Design a protein around this nucleic acid. Sequence first.
RNA 1: GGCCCUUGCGGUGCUCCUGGAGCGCUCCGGGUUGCAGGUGCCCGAGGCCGA
RNA 2: AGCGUGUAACCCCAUUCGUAGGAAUUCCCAGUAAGUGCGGGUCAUAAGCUUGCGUUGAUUAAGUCCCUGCCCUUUACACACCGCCCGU
Lengths: 49, 290, 87, 190, 204, 51, 94, 122, 139, 408
Amino acid sequence: KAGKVPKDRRRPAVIREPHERKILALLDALSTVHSQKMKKAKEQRHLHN
Amino acid sequence: MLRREARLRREYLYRKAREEAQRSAQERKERLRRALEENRLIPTELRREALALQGSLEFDDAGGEGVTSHVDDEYRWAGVEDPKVMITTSRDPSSRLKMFAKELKLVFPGAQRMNRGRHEVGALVRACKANGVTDLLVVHEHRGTPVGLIVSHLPFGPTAYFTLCNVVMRHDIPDLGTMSEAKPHLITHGFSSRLGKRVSDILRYLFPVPKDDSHRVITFANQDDYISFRHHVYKKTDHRNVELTEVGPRFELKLYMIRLGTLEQEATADVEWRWHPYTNTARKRVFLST
Amino acid sequence: VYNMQSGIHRGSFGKDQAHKGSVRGVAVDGLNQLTVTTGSEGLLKFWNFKNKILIHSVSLSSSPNIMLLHRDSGILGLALDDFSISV
Amino acid sequence: PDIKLFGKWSTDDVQINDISLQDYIAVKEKYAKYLPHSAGRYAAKRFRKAQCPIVERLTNSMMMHGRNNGKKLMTVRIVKHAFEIIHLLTGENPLQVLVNAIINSGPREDSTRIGRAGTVRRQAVDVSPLRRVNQAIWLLCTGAREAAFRNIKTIAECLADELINAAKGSSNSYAIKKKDELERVAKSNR
Amino acid sequence: KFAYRFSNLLGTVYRRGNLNFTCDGNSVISPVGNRVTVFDLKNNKSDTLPLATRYNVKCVGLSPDGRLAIIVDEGGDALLVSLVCRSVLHHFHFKGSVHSVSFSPDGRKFVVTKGNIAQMYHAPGKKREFNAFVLDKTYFGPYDETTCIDWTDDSRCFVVGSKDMSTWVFGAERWDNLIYYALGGHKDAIVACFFESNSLDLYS
Amino acid sequence: KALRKKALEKNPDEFYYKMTRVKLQDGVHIIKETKEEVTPEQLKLMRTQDV
Amino acid sequence: DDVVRKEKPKEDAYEYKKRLTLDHESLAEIYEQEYIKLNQQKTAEEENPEHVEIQKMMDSLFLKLDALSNFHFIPKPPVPEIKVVSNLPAITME
Amino acid sequence: RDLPERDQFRVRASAALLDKLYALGLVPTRGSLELCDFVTASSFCRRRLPTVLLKLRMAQHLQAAVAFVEQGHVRVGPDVVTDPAFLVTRSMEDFVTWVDSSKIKRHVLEYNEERDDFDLEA
Amino acid sequence: GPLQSVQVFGRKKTATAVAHCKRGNGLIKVNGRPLEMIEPRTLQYKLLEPVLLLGKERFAGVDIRVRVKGGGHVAQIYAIRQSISKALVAYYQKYVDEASKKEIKDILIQYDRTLLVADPRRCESKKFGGPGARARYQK
Amino acid sequence: TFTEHSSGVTGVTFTATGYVVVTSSMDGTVRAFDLHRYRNFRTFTSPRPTQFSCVAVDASGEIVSAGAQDSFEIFVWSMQTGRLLDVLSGHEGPISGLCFNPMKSVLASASWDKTVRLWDMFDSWRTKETLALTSDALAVTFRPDGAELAVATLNSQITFWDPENAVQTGSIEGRHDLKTGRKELDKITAKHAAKGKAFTALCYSADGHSILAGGMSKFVCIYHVREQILMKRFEISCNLSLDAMEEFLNRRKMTEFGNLALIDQDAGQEDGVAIPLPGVRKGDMSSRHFKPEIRVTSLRFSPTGRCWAATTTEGLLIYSLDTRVLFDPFELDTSVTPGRVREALRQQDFTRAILMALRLNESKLVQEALEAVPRGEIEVVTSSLPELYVEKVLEFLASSFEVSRHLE
RNA sequence: GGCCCUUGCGGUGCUCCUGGAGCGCUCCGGGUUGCAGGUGCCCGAGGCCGA
RNA sequence: AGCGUGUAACCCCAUUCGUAGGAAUUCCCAGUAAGUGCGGGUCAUAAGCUUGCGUUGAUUAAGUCCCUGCCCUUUACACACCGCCCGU
Ligand SMILES: [Mg+2]
Ligand SMILES: [Mg+2]
Ligand SMILES: [Mg+2]
Ligand SMILES: [Mg+2]
């Protein structure tokens, strides 16, 4: 895991503007739906074959 | 030595897997041989590759060992050398368990009994292999009566598990005397199935080659998967009339497990045969007789 | 005494000094058992090599000049200032 | 360096006055140890226990007598306390006292036995030095154990008194009485 | 305390080289690998000489008187040794490999055959010098490596066999009638060549 | 059972080049994360970017 | 129904003598018959060229095979046999 | 094979031949003479020390295995073997191991957390 | 330049001790505690045997830390003694001349061999051997 | 010469009393031969086909013992019976060597599991002892008195143990002393090879005060056992026609592509007679036969004590006592000189002359002193002779009988 | 310990005699070189594998 | 301390208090006798019982056939030694 990082070595995280967070959340929601649809369609192809 | 022992085990397991294949190859060879000796059709299965089997027939001779048997590999030194038997008990034995283990030393010729203290089971097997111990016996007790017996063949031989039913020891019977200690004659009766032949082989190889004039007899009789152990000495008072006097312990055996490995290999060894009591037809089935 | 491999001092002979005058010659026997030294004062001393304890002292008629030891035979050669050789 | 038992009892001044028992009492420079606890295997071979230091032998023989077996550190502390009490009372080396007690407690001849159902007959025979040492240690330990039983007195003081009396040669000790009776029976049976 | 000296080399009687009998003929000189042993058949004795060499002995030459001997290894190092005192007298280094060494029966000269040539040297004298042997003459006859040497009884001429299927006879001194002569008639390597008792008549 | 049988014929003298750079931890083969190996000049640039 | 003794290829010097005495039935006559039989068995080997030829080529192969193993092979047990010694001084054996 | 099957000479010779081949490892089992016909030149190569090192998992690469013996890191018993052309017997196969005071053995012990400076370097 | 350090193992039954010896001033610690604080103190002299055999002069130039795990009290104590002795011998071999190592090793062996060589106990009994002597049994 | 053995001879020995020699071979046989009738009267073989590596016999001679390459067990037979008494098991790995105690009749055997085991033959309870070692053991030898034991180990250490007490008396380091040279075909250097080589031959002197060690070298090392130092190094051979003689190979023979030893190898193998076979270490069919490597195969010291022998690749080497090697006087003084010796001879003061000549260790002076004494005065001189000089006079007499005309 | 235009630091380019393996050279001498029988050698891939 | 993935006691330092099982009989040789704790219930057996694993660790003995018994024998010619079991 090696999660630990020294205080001097660590850097502050990026702070996002609300605009791109709306875009980034939209893509992940679209990606979640698309991934589910392809996996469901795979089983239908597997069953019929 | 440890590397040598591991190498011999892999050699033994490798030969065991291919034993069935050689038997089928051997069987096909004899069918071709009969077809050649008596002028007949080659069987349709043997029609192809017939020349190769014919070439093999010329190469076969008495010099070759023949088809291998896993039983023969386990008991390699059965006839040539006398077996060496060691008897031990579970940790903290009872008073009567030590008395039973003392009698089993007398029954088996050349057997030795050693105290079980704080010895690890794996350490015990290592010492037995180093000093050439052939067979190891472990006996269990319940409330002062023997209840279980384990027979292990040290050179990666089979391990057989038994349960004792009706144990009567010499120490309970007063004024018996001393035993004959001669090399005994063995009587095997009631074993007809393939498994019964397998079990009787393990019990018989515990004993050395006797003399022709020996008067000591040990009997193993099978009846409904229960093996009865009897020890007798006989005197010929006259021709055709013989008298029998019972000596030594008397107990019953019921086998329930055979494993390929030694008793230090519980987690790795395969099970050749196991008793299944929850089978739907387990009540009406026997395995030691046909 | 110094170690050849590491160069570490391994002790000295005598409480403060081995001899009053200059040390003319030193020698160690083949078995590393006895050590012999000479001084300009004219004394011949024998020392144990291990524990560095004095064994015996021999007075010389003249001051020693050079000294060599034949280890195998155990024979010691001394050349003195009076032109004589003592064995 | 100098090796002293328990860090305070020297072994160089200890000397043995019996020529026969010099080879069977291990107290000298090679057998000098800081503690009577070495975890050695002295019962593996015949005659090897003669190489065991006599303090360790006394510790081992004091574990079998009147105790739950296997408690060796307690016996070591008992021996240490007994040696301290001996030094306080007498003012000399307790190792010398132990050696003198073992020398005095050892019988010189015993009676070998010829026994039937009716009566027993006797014959005086000699005793080997190893059996002398073993029997002297056994008698001293048994005397200390029987003295300490059912009395308001810890085992250390009884053991110290037993060694003091045996080394002195007085008749107040159990081991001296046992030795005298055994040699008397052997003398009467010559 | 531990004062020991080498005495004899048992277990070996011949490795490589040429065998020789002593002058009287009772003892035999045999090279055993690095060393040389004398076997006295007269007294039933074996004696390994104390001398040692860097390489295996290839050539052993004996002086006619029986006092001196020359022992040469494979590498070309040569030792002049006295058989009477069993001590190595002197050292020498021939530049190249020598096939054989032979003394003249008179005992004043000896021939060393090396490479394609044969070099004739004087016998060692009583005078002691840094260089053991003074080179006298050189002969450069054969095509290929020379093998064997033989001397006439009068020590006037000598003969050398060679690998070039021919034998060359040379003169110890420059004779007007005979400087050198060559003999053929063979289709393989010459192994040995000999002379008569009192003639130049020869065998190949 | 398959894992335990493989331990029987394990050779203690077996050698792999992966063994040189990796050390066991309690018998478990943990792959430690690779280092970054930053330099002081690089380190000073990160702190200026952060402020 | 006992353990049956298997057949040994090795024959010790104590059972070899036993075999000869059993069939024949003084010591020299027993050895005399065996010596004649052993020579007769030896002779028949040489008159069969095929056994002779194959014996020599077996020897060549076994010598080569032993060196490759650096003389680490399973040994052959010694056969008990009879040898003829003559009544003459021991100097000749030197 | 051409000899009669019921011949004492054939039986003794056949048993003698197969036990030598089995000892060197050229033949898998001491069966009939049919197995004696399967030996090739490659059978001898499989018994060499570098390829036996490969099977024992001491080395994973054949050029690496040849390197180890040539650099004196493998021993057969107390003796150290440098010649790659060295046919190892089945019995001798049990006793091929890293020579002591070798760097490769140090790496093996370091990985297993069994590195002892006293025992190894001594 | 680089630090001079040696790590050594000591074993006794199921007790295992790891000892690290480096250049230092004479500090010897076991599990972060001094030598005198290790229990039981009845065998405390058992824990002090090497230093008393060698003196404070030889231990004055090294720091040793011991980490012991497993087993009981006595096995742990013996493991710590073995680890200390072996670590000191290894350090004097690697970073000091061989003569001091040889003499110290000879002293330690002459006192007690278990300080440097661990001898685990196996099962050897008369029951393994047959009745009677090795010779004269069955003729 | 005896030719009953078909394969190579691994070990030989003599019985303590009789003129009987016992031999073990790779045939699987141990054979006994007598020097009275020159016959092989007894042969011992194992019930299981095994090959033997070494042999040891008791001082009584009733017991014969041998060890195996593969079965890893010791076989013990009776000499008079000829049957197998027992098989000793417990070792792991091949057995390095066996030896019987000269005075106690117990067996010491070394194995490659870092152990030396002691076996008691005439013990009712079958006592056995184990001596653990840090490294692989190669040789075991007893001192002639039997009170000390020596083990050579693979780390080149010779450890001296007390057998009855099972305690290690001492140790000797000898890796540096066994100087080893590189063979012509070796890619590694001499030091790297030497890091993996140890002593393979050990031998006590008759007095036991010194030990001899040998192995993969041209040097035999003589050590003082009590002081644990090397007294002397003997150079067995200086022949440079044998491989590995020198530590550093000549830079002259190098070219760009190496030393090219295979060409000289084939030039050597032009001897013919057989065909070289790949991988054979020794023999005619071995590739490296023309230039065999230098080895001290075995060392032994005479019971008489005036010589010692070694079997090496060169052959059998014998080294004998010689007065010329070292001057070893006993008790010198300025009065002790041959002039005073001949003076005391002239005044017929035989005892003082003989004593002072014995204080010198020159054999000719004591020879002249003893031969000067007329008969009838012998007993006076013997009575006047002190106890210490008796052994010196006996040693001189024993030396004298060999080369003196005046036997009686 | 010594060092004073220095360094617990690093690198280069030439020279440094072949055991057999650069033989043959003081003088003298080098001119007229004065068909036995041979028949060789080479040709096997099957993994108790590792990755 | 050491075995045991199915949704520590014992010991140790100090404080206080204060005067057990006949006659017979069985078993046991080294990490053995004896003490102490901690787990599992594994296709048989096992519940106040069965079996693992660790901790501490001894006294005596290493040889005779006297008693009580058992197994065998009294028909490979080195040297040396030895020189016929008996009865119905
Ligand atoms: Mg118990
Ligand atoms: Mg317990
Ligand atoms: Mg009670
Ligand atoms: Mg419990």
